[PDB]
Design a protein around this ligand. Sequence first.
Ligand SMILES: [Zn+2]
Ligand SMILES: [Zn+2]
Ligand SMILES: [Zn+2]
Ligand SMILES: [Zn+2]
Ligand SMILES: [Zn+2]
Ligand SMILES: [Zn+2]
Ligand SMILES: [Zn+2]
Ligand SMILES: [Zn+2]
Ligand SMILES: [Zn+2]
Ligand SMILES: [Zn+2]
Length: 302
Amino acid sequence: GALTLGFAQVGGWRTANTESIKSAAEEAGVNLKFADANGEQEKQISAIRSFIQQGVDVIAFSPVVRTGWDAVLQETKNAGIPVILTDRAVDTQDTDVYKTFIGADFIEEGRRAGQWVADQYASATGPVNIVQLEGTTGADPAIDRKTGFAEGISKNPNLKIVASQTGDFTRSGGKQVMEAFLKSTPQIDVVFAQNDDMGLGAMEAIEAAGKKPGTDIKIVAVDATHDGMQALADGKFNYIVECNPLLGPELMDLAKKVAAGEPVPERVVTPDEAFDQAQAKAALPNRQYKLAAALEHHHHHH
Ligand SMILES: [Zn+2]
Ligand SMILES: [Zn+2]
Ligand SMILES: [Zn+2]
Ligand SMILES: [Zn+2]
Ligand SMILES: [Zn+2]
Ligand SMILES: [Zn+2]
Ligand SMILES: [Zn+2]
Ligand SMILES: [Zn+2]
Ligand SMILES: [Zn+2]
Ligand SMILES: [Zn+2]
């Protein structure tokens, strides 16, 4: 009587990865059945139907698209199998077709980035000119991080976004746009980079212009990646924020709750990360050791 969890993976932006889900199920004693939709909704819908046929206790999936799940979700509800959504939220026209959604909040990321700018410059004695390197036009995290950042700086009107342009989430995109900003904007105090790569690009443009990233022009970015954190530890970025994807254990814990009929909230929040330079300098070199210790304990499951 191990709980059986069917999980239909996609094949996106802040997505729980397979190793995390597989390892968390081993740790929780959950019998995990994986399916791969290969980017395609009809194949995810088939995987869900096959889990219903296999009589799993709980079905979770990471929706490849927001819409068009109501029919298959009626089939799960009719089979009495609870459903948990991960990573991407759905649009539904029905009531109570899934138990809970677990995923990252991109508006919150932008907001925390904005709020750090507001905090750091609460006493600025001159205007604070912010330039923004946006993600790919129309991408959900790009739209939301922009919305969030605007909210985070909204209580201090000395903070002004004086230029905002897509760098398409890439290093070369961020570098190219920052060059343009340096040409068009005589006074830049802060860059808000909606991901680490664009921030790293920007840092190189700032350096090529003979300026000092992190001191002359401060950089606040999203994504606590190795290279982002390395820049921050080197004092070339000033602040990083991240809203995590699903980690794994909370999914396993929720799966147990919903299989037992315990009511759960319709949304469960993921954890967050944030680092200034001092915090990155402590955390970064250590990560390899914490990772290795954890992998060692876990390998006894294999
Ligand atoms: Zn494992
Ligand atoms: Zn264990
Ligand atoms: Zn309907
Ligand atoms: Zn969104
Ligand atoms: Zn990256
Ligand atoms: Zn968060
Ligand atoms: Zn600190
Ligand atoms: Zn151990
Ligand atoms: Zn051991
Ligand atoms: Zn192993």
